[PDB]
Design a protein around this ligand. Structure first.
Ligand SMILES: CCCCCCCCCCCCCCCC(=O)O
Ligand SMILES: CCCCCCCCCCCCCCCC(=O)O
Ligand SMILES: [Fe+3]
Ligand SMILES: [Fe+3]
Ligand SMILES: [Mn+2]
Ligand SMILES: [Mn+2]
Ligand SMILES: [Mn+3]
Ligand SMILES: [Mn+3]
Lengths: 285, 285
């Protein structure tokens, strides 16, 4: 369907737009390249482990590799919907969002290749709760935007993607990686990647907050929808956390070997804290 | 619609895929930031010009600003279509393609802001032929991909976007900018941007060649479709070139002032040469 005109012909970019400012920060802070990460010591760490210790790390990597790939594919309908609404600065920013996710997919896949598990199918560590979030609910909410870009639909898409997948699960997985392997001295290349990912993710979450708040600013009754959509997904968030916890409690050899009191009760509470504080970053008024 | 699984969980990125290699080159060669270009001398050059000389440069900038904005919006359906086909490496590459176009929009809009014409509506320099390409035919061909991702549809989309808009018009506009202003010593910041754009554009055109050739490799009869779709748009390509030429011939004060024998017959022949050589980069066999 035709373009009726172009903002940068009739006028200019809105230089003061919050998403233009976020785009500018993304360019400045987004230079890192996964191809430059030295994974040679990760290969050695992984080979040094027993099979039982090897396993310990794979469920979390399985969750991230699928998650990064899902969000790379599934952000495209948001870019389309805001493009069709004429929100040029949002779209400029989203090009950095999408390119970030591509690098995130690349990073975890390089690590798998380097440590020797590229040929292993890690889908076995996706339980029903994970699938409900990543194989179903996320693509459903985003793809809806192609035929329904109502405020309700945009709120739901940003809530599932930015507040739950990124702002609750991703943030907690970054924390979990540091709490376990940074402590152990293991996988320095992976943890360099996690640090870069965590920096990118901050901008993604801020886009989600901006998006949800500007819709809530129009009609405070959308605040109730945001809360409702957060709570709808919580059972799957915690059901996946519990599954990963149960796997950690059953395979403890990496913990013993490296003297890690991995506090699964603390990890759980970090997740609950992440979820509650995303809710508090949306002001009803 | 659900994900059935993820390539980077079951396996890895196809590291030898041509579009993964193009993505890798795009990251290495795509660091430039329009925000770092010094436009202070462009502001002075522009203010130094007479109104009659001022006008000379605006039609070409008008064509580029709209063109960059159109392609930023209109590449999204190609990313979607290849994503839904599972072409993960194409999608990774396309994130760099989209982010490039965002920077291109930003670059021309910064120049307009800096030289003092941000408030001027440059739509007056889009004639009917230009509109047919950029306001209509381009969005029609790309948006079709949301409901029709047949080889015919993908060939047509790549032909309009990558071979005509980028590989014929953009390439010729880069040449035109150098032939006129690089000669004059004018607008150094703009020409720094043009150089960066021309480097990015090379990767975009190569994606289009890859895309069209891999479909032609399946069924040589698609070669005829490629040629047919190139010829369908030629009248609008040359009709826009003629319009810009006629405007250049009527407002010649910048040429006289700066002693430029602007060879409009040469510019025209560069366009014809661009078009014919894009055709020859697709092998029927
Ligand atoms: C054992 C403690 C549980 C901690 C929670 C771990 C969750 C793993 C994260 C996997 C999904 C990652 C989503 C990526 C989204 C993005 O990159 O924007
Ligand atoms: C007077 C000689 C005519 C030369 C032809 C000039 C055409 C101007 C170009 C405007 C469209 C630019 C399209 C940008 C596409 C992209 O950035 O991928
Ligand atoms: Fe993210
Ligand atoms: Fe381009
Ligand atoms: Mn359960
Ligand atoms: Mn005509
Ligand atoms: Mn990510
Ligand atoms: Mn461009």
């Amino acid at each position: 369907v035709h373009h009726d005109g172009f903002q940068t012909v009739k006028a200019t970019i809105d230089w003061e737009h919050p998403m233009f400012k976020l785009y500018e920060k993304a360019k400045r802070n987004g230079k890192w390249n996964p191809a430059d990460i030295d994974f040679s010591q990760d290969q050695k760490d992984f080979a040094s482990l027993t099979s039982e210790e090897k396993i310990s790390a794979l469920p979390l990597v399985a969750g991230f590799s699928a998650g990064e790939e899902a969000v790379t594919l599934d952000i495209l309908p948001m870019a389309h919907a805001l493009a069709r609404q004429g929100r040029l600065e949002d779209v400029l920013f989203l090009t950095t969002f999408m390119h970030d996710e591509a690098k995130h997919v690349e990073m975890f896949s390089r690590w798998q290749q380097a440590v020797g598990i590229g040929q292993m199918d890690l889908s076995v560590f996706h339980n029903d709760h994970y699938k409900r979030i990543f194989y179903e609910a996320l693509p459903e909410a985003m793809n809806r935007l192609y035929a329904d870009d109502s405020p309700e639909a945009v709120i739901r898409a940003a809530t599932v993607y930015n507040m739950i997948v990124e702002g609750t699960l991703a943030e907690s997985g970054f924390y979990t990686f540091r709490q376990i392997y940074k402590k152990a001295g293991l996988f320095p290349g992976l943890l360099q990647g996690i640090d870069y990912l965590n920096m990118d993710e901050g901008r993604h979450i801020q886009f989600g907050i901006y998006t949800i708040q500007r819709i809530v600013n129009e009609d405070e009754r959308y605040y109730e929808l945001f809360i409702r959509y957060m709570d709808e997904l919580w059972p799957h968030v915690i059901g996946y956390v519990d599954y990963l916890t149960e796997l950690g409690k059953r395979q403890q050899q990496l913990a013993r070997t490296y003297a890690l009191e991995i506090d699964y009760d603390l990890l759980r509470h970090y997740v609950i804290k992440q979820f509650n504080l995303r809710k508090k970053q949306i002001s009803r008024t």
